[PDB]
Amino acid sequence: LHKEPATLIKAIDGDTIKLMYKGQPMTFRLLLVDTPETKHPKKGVEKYGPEASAFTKKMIENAKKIEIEFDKGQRTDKYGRGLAYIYADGKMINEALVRQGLAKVAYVYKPNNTHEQHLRKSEAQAKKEKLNIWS
Numbered sequence: 001l002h003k004e005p006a007t008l009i010k011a012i013d014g015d016t017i018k019l020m021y022k023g024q025p026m027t028f029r030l031l032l033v034d035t036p037e038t039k040h041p042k043k044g045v046e047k048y049g050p051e052a053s054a055f056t057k058k059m060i061e062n063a064k065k066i067e068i069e070f071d072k073g074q075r076t077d078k079y080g081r082g083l084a085y086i087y088a089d090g091k092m093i094n095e096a097l098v099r100q101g102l103a104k105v106a107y108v109y110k111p112n113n114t115h116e117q118h119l120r121k122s123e124a125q126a127k128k129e130k131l132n133i134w135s
């Protein structure tokens with residue numbers, strides 16, 4: 001796996017970010033995590049959804065450098081969103097959300113599970129600490 005540069009376009013919610021990648025606008029979805037829903041009427045605004053959204057926005061806007069890292073398998077989902085680990089000054093947003101209890105580990109689809117154990121350990125800590133989603 002390797003990290004590639006990208007420039008911000010707009011943070012959509014906790015786990016979906018529009019980025020300029022190789023000079024094309026693409027929507028990315030964070031691998032291995034789900035922040036609670038805030039757009040879809042079928043789930044409604046779920047608790048911590050808005051909180052997750054503001055956390056990601058904050059983290060990605062303040063970054064000096066944004067990087068994306070695809071995993072070993074599919075690089076897009078069925079909606080055409082890029083599937084990646086995204087880093088803001090070398091800090092993985094996917095992990096940072098999980099560590100705050102603002103996302104759960106989810107959508108673990110082989111072979112895109114390289115950081116699964118890393119993320120699960122951050123989740124276990126947020127749970128033990130009773131943070132946000134786990135409170």
Ligand SMILES: Cc1cn([C@H]2C[C@H](OP(=O)(O)O)[C@@H](COP(=O)(O)O)O2)c(=O)[nH]c1=O
Nearest residue numbers: 016029030031032033034077078083107109
């Ligand atoms: C993170 C991730 C999501 N998805 C798909 C599965 C879910 O589609 P369905 O909605 O059709 O089930 C959806 C979860 O995304 P959101 O959390 O943005 O809803 O995106 C993948 O296909 N692969 C991935 O790695």
Ligand SMILES: [Ca+2]
Nearest residue numbers: 015034035036
């Ligand atoms: Ca979500």
